[PDB]
Every structure is written in C-alpha cells, then in structure tokens.
C-alpha cells in the first residue's frame, strides 16, 4: 500500500540527509538549510533560498550520486534507491520523475544550486501526487 512506498522514500530521505551537518561545516551553509530539510516532506512547504539547493548538491556528492557537471548520475541514483528498499521498477520511476523535473528546469542562470532546488521542488510535488511522501 502507499504506506510501504512512503517507508522506502523515508529510508532514502533519512540516508540522503545523514551528512547534512558535515556539508554545513564544509560549505558554511546557513542553518535555514536544516529547517528546509526538517520540513522537506511537509505538504505546502516552500523552500527558503538557493542554499538549500547547494545542500542537496553536497549531500548528492557525498553519496557519489552527482556527475562532474553537478547533474544527477541517473544510474547511481537508481542503485541508491534499490539499496534502500526500492524495487527496480520503483527506482526507475523515481529517476524518471527527477529526469522529467530536470527537463522542465533548464539551467538558464548557470546556477546549479537554484536549478537543483527547482528540480527538488518539482520532485517533491510529483511524490506528493503519488502519495509517496512520508510524514
């Protein structure tokens, strides 16, 4: 049921966010990133600023999920989902959601942080639409 899928997204989310303290101390990120992460799955929550996108990129890099251009490595992202309990179909669906969001969010501003935050907002909305967002 939707609760089982939510549990996969919870496991993914918690493991993804584990190194946030390390990222904050390495990059001098504002404490607003920690607030945005606490509220990441809260329905109707809007993110604070582009530094939350920088935090998402730092967490992605620590988990070796980014390519050299700071874009998601689709294969590594799929495998990350499977290691946290996604079946191959669910993992492929999650990567397709991120890919669709990235195609809707070209990096016109040469700002990987703001582009990443916009992709994350789009991904969050798609996950709520599927009732896959954990409380």
Author numbering: 24 to 158
Published text:
Cotton bollworm (Helicoverpa armigera) is a worldwide agricultural pest in which the transport of pheromones is indispensable and perceived by pheromone-binding proteins (PBPs). Here, we solved three structures of the cotton bollworm HarmPBP1 at different pH values and its complex with ligand, Z-9-hexadecenal. The HarmPBP1 scaffold contains three conserved disulfide bonds linking α-helices α1 and α3 (Cys46-Cys81), α3 and α6 (Cys77-Cys136), and α5 and α6 (Cys124-Cys145), encapsulating the hydrophobic pocket for pheromones binding. The structure of HarmPBP1 was found to contain a hydrophobic cavity formed by the five helices α1, α3, α4, α5, and α6.
The apo-HarmPBP1 structure at pH 7.5 was determined by molecular replacement and refined to a resolution of 1.3 Å in the space group of P21, with an Rwork of 17.9% and an Rfree of 19.8%. The structure was built in the electron density map, except for the C-terminal residues 159-170. Although apo-HarmPBP1 adopts a common PBP scaffold of six α-helices surrounding a predominantly hydrophobic central pocket, the conformation is greatly distinct from other apo-PBPs. Surprisingly, the structural similarity between apo-HarmPBP1 and all other apo-GOBPs or apo-PBPs was lower as the RMSD was larger than 1.5 Å, revealing a distinct conformation of apo-HarmPBP1 compared with other apo-PBPs. The most significant structural differences between apo-HarmPBP1 and other known insect PBPs were observed at the C terminus. The last 12 residues were missed in the structure of apo-HarmPBP1, which might have been a result of crystal packing. However, the conformations of both termini as well as some loops differed significantly between apo-HarmPBP1 and the apo-BmorPBP/apo-ApolPBP1. The first helix of HarmPBP1 occupied the C-terminal helix position of the above two structures. In the apo-HarmPBP1, there was a channel through the ligand binding pocket. In the apo-HarmPBP1 structure, part of the Lys138 side chain was flexible. Moreover, the arrangements of both proteins in the crystal packing were different, revealing that the little structural difference was not caused by experimental errors.
